[PDB]
C-alpha cells in the first residue's frame, strides 16, 4: 500500500483505488496501473522532473529503503494476477530488488523528488510505475 500527495492530487496504484478515489477521479490508465484523484487538503510531495536512473525505494515487506539503479519507462509484459489478465504495462521501470504484491504503493525517489511507485515484480526484479511525465500534477 501507499500513495503520492502532490497539490490537490492523490496518486495510487489503480488496482488499490478506493470508492472515494473513483468518485473524485481526475485521471486513470489501466495500462499504467495508475489512478489520480482529487483531495481537499494540500499534499507535501514533490514529483521529480528528470531522467534519473538511480534512486531509493521503500520495501514494506522488508521495512527497508533500498538504493537501486532502474531502467527508463517502457512497455513491459506483465503476467496475469488477481487484478489484471496477462498484458503489457506501459511507463514501467525495473530494478534488481526485492518486492512482493503488498509492496505496491512504495515510493521510488531520486534527488529531485518522487519518481514512481512499486507496481510489479517477481524473480528478484521490482517494477515501478513512472509518474515524472504527468506534468499536470505540478499545476491546477
Ligand atoms: C509488486 N510485486 N512484487 C512482486 C510481485 C509479484 C506479482 C505481482 C502481481 N501484481 C501485478 C500488478 C500489476 N501492476 O499488474 C497488480 C497487482 C499484483 O498483485 C506483483 C508483484
Ligand atoms: Zn531525478
UniProtKB/Swiss-Prot annotation:
Active site: 15 (for protease 2a activity), 33 (for protease 2a activity), 104 (for protease 2a activity)
Transmembrane segments: none
UniProt-annotated binding residues for Zn(2+) 1: 50, 52, 110, 112
Catalytic activity of the protein: Selective cleavage of Tyr-|-Gly bond in the picornavirus polyprotein
Source organism, top-level taxon: Viruses
UniProt function note: Cysteine protease that cleaves viral polyprotein and specific host proteins. It is responsible for the autocatalytic cleavage between the P1 and P2 regions, which is the first cleavage occurring in the polyprotein. Also cleaves the host translation initiation factor EIF4G1, in order to shut down the capped cellular mRNA translation. Inhibits the host nucleus-cytoplasm protein and RNA trafficking by cleaving host members of the nuclear pores. Counteracts stress granule formation probably by antagonizing its assembly or promoting its dissassembly.
Oligomeric form and interacting partners: Homodimer.
Stated name of the protein: Protease 2A
Organism of origin: Coxsackievirus A16 (strain G-10)
Amino acid at each position: 500500500s501507499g500513495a503520492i500527495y502532490v497539490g490537490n492530487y492523490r496518486v495510487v496504484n489503480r488496482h488499490l483505488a478506493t470508492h472515494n478515489d473513483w468518485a473524485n477521479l481526475v485521471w486513470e490508465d489501466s495500462s499504467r496501473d495508475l489512478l489520480v484523484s482529487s483531495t481537499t487538503a494540500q499534499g507535501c510531495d514533490t514529483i521529480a522532473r528528470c531522467d534519473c536512473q538511480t534512486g531509493v525505494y521503500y520495501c514494506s515487506s522488508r521495512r527497508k529503503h533500498y538504493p537501486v539503479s532502474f531502467s527508463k519507462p517502457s512497455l513491459i509484459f506483465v503476467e496475469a494476477s488477481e487484478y489484471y489478465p496477462a498484458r503489457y504495462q506501459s511507463h514501467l521501470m525495473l530494478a534488481v530488488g526485492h518486492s512482493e504484491p503488498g509492496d505496491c504503493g512504495g515510493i521510488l525517489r531520486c534527488q529531485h523528488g518522487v519518481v514512481g511507485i512499486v507496481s510489479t515484480g517477481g524473480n528478484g526484479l521490482v517494477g515501478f510505475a513512472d509518474v515524472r511525465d504527468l506534468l499536470w500534477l505540478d499545476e491546477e
